[PDB]
Design a protein around this nucleic acid. Sequence first.
DNA 1: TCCGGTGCCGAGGCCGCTCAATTGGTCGTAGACAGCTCTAGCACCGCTTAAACGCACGTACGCGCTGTCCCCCGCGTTTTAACCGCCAAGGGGATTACTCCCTAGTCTCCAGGCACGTGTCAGAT
DNA 2: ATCTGACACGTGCCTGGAGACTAGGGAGTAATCCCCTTGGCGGTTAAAACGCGGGGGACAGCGCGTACGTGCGTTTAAGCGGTGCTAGAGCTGTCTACGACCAATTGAGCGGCCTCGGCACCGGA
Lengths: 197, 197, 202, 202
Amino acid sequence: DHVSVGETQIPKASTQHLLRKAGSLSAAGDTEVPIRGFVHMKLHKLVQKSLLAMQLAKRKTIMKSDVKKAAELMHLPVFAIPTKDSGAKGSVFLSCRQKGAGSAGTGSETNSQEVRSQMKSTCLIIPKERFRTMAKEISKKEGHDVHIAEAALDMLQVIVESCTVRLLEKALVITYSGKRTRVTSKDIETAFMLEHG
Amino acid sequence: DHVSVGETQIPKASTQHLLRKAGSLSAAGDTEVPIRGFVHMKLHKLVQKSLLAMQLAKRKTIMKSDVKKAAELMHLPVFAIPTKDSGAKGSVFLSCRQKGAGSAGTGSETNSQEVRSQMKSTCLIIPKERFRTMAKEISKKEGHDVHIAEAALDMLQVIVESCTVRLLEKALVITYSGKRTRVTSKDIETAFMLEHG
Amino acid sequence: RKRDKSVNFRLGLRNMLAQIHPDISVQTEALSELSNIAVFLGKKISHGAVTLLPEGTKTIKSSAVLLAAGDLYGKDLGRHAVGEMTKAVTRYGSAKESKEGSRSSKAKLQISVARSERLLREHGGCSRVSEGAAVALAAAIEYFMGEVLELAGNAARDSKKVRISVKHITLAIQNDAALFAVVGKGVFSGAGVSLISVPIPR
Amino acid sequence: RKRDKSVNFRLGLRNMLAQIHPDISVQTEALSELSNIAVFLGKKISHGAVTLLPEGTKTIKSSAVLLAAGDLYGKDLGRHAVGEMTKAVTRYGSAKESKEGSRSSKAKLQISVARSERLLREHGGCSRVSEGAAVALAAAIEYFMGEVLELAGNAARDSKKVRISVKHITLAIQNDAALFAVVGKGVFSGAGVSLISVPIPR
DNA sequence: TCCGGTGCCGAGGCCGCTCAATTGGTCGTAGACAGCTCTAGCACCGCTTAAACGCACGTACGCGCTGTCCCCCGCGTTTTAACCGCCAAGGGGATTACTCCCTAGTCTCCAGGCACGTGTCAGAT
DNA sequence: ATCTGACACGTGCCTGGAGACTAGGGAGTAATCCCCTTGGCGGTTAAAACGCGGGGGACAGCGCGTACGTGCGTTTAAGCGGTGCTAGAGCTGTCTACGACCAATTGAGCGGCCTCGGCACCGGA
């Protein structure tokens, strides 16, 4: 359990999008609340580190270097684009999941199209300003309510999304060790338990 | 798979001793070759680091500080006794597993005695000089054949044993997530896969 | 024959120990145990505060260490600890205005008042270090050691042992999630397990 | 407006790129990708060789970096790399005896000849650094970048893309276990998966 | 099975050495605060539309049950060296002592890297 | 077959980098003493090595139980522009506060040795 649940959480469709991005073939209907919780959790840790950093800096706004040093304090090797980073739109479309061309729904993996199409996407998958709303809201609830730079915000996007993808990958490993196809929430908490515990 | 298997490996009874020390209730008959392999693997990594360290030191023998800095290069927080460390004999006996006093074999866990008795042992479980033979043999096969200090050797004992116990603990977590009692080798490789992969 | 080289721990650890638990004593091996745990905590927090936080070559600040402890320590434990940190700041302010000062270390309960300058400055993340930061470290390590040591002494009394044993420290750390998450990552005597709970099929 | 501050990568990365693959070009974003991967590798190996290995305040030695790379790099890859390291040692010996020397960087294929002194000395593990160690770093990072970049360019040709894309780097790293184990620990664009194999019930 | 008598080596206590920790002092230096410029973050509007959420259908997926077989674990016995202790020996670890090689510090020269602007084809439809 | 825009290429500017020279210490090498490793003998013993009974552990076929995957429609807002405000991001200035560095002082810590009692073993009730 131990799932921090705030009052603003990125849509569930985005969550299963992340899941299939990590290669989740199928997820239980409860898999989504916990992943929202722990993406919130990673976000919260990162923003706390960065924000206390800038507070030390006698600073009033987060910039790229801020979350940079914060993340490598989290012990993650990190870097992102200052000029023109990958955004959201940019992506393989949802309704083009059908394939008239090379029909999906065959086996090995069955879907065979959605996962490939979404993984081959450079773009960030979480809508930018919903995430920005989380950032501002958490900087409210603890953060002393300071300004955010979209560059730092988006590098935060990439950090958190890739980290949670790594989490889900470990979870899929867990599931296959459990010799079953669909991923459960319990699988995700077990993954996080191994991750730190 | 990917199990390095040398030509000198500490007895299997010691392996299952480690297993039950970590709290393994029961292990498949194949669980023991892989754990030997990966204890060898951790040993090999550690000794390589330490030995290249002393080779930098223009040194001819490993001492405590050597494996100390090597291990914290491995990113493990490490320390052990220079005066009088826990040895081997020292331990709760194997034949006193019976309990005339407080009979074992009841349930919750069933054995209820062997695991407790062995976990409550301060002493190192692997025979010292078999391990010393591994150290010398590996310093042959790669190490340029230099002298060893028993103090550094024994702190190496504690490092490797505790690390592999952590491994087995993660493996037990895996097994229970797999909803089954006995641990399999495959479980151990999955554990290591999560560990680094 | 030759005099010692490493970081001084023995007296300071047994110092303030009696006020934590007077009846209870220590094992020398457990004493070295706690010693290296302390110096590890110093290394980690010093590395965080120094190597990570200040942009550029800026001085290491007492507030820097304060934040470092706050993050490194748990949510509640960190919050309580940092308040204690400021308390120590006030105490050392009283020390420095006092002419007596640190000659008797003015209630700096652990020898940490002496080991702090070491663990910061010769950690060599930079050269530029405020003494207030050193006091902050002294307080942080001292609170951490006080809490863990008190739990250990309580365990020893539970085991009815006059002098502490290393297994008591093990049980204390695995017992408290807050302390464990800080230092349980490390390795030490015996198996060093985490003792995963609920042995039930998932 | 203001001139740059960070570690120079662009030309040196596209330098020697044509000999690796002439037809193939780079993406600017992929160029920064490879840049920070390079400087990370420099940081890690510099930290190993310097902070870890030499007892006391002893000089950082070329052999120190040599061993650092050998361990950090894979078994076979490290063995091949260290031989190449000594080759670079000989090459820079020829450089230093030459009056021309490093003014044209004498076949120091990457700008690594310039970034090396930075990544070592201002890593600040110590102050005491041999230039030979810097050449060793230059060689190590340069071989690593050459191998990964060649694999990436081959992937781009497989994708029939004139300029490299970041996904090509991703695929290259996940493809080679040796490179991945060194640098796949890090994070980067997109999901950053490891793509665990054999999706079969265990 | 619980409590008290038996016994030891280990912990506590003591002595003494000297150097760690402290103190004041200065220096200069790092930095903290004040002030100016103008970018961009933020707010708001407002439009487009893609996505999110809600709704339906069905069947795919979790997994436990018998039921099978099927395997390590308890118990045992058999076997040899692990441990331990002592002795020999010398390898080498640390320590002192002697020599010189190495880079940093400074200055100077220089060029290849930095930005900024214009036209063209790389890549997606 | 075409269009958007990323980039290849041209112009202009200067700091990153390199080389000569030096200071000087940091480093490498060498000699010596004995401490501590390495090996060998001898002994016990206890664990390694191994098998049998069994009883439970694992799962194939199968259905139980369902709710999630797929698919479609609507509403919300996500994206993205557009405008404006200004907060504030960065750079430079002064003023000085503070923490290095030097030197002297003090007694706390700790090595080493001696004392002994907390603690393990076991017999009696």
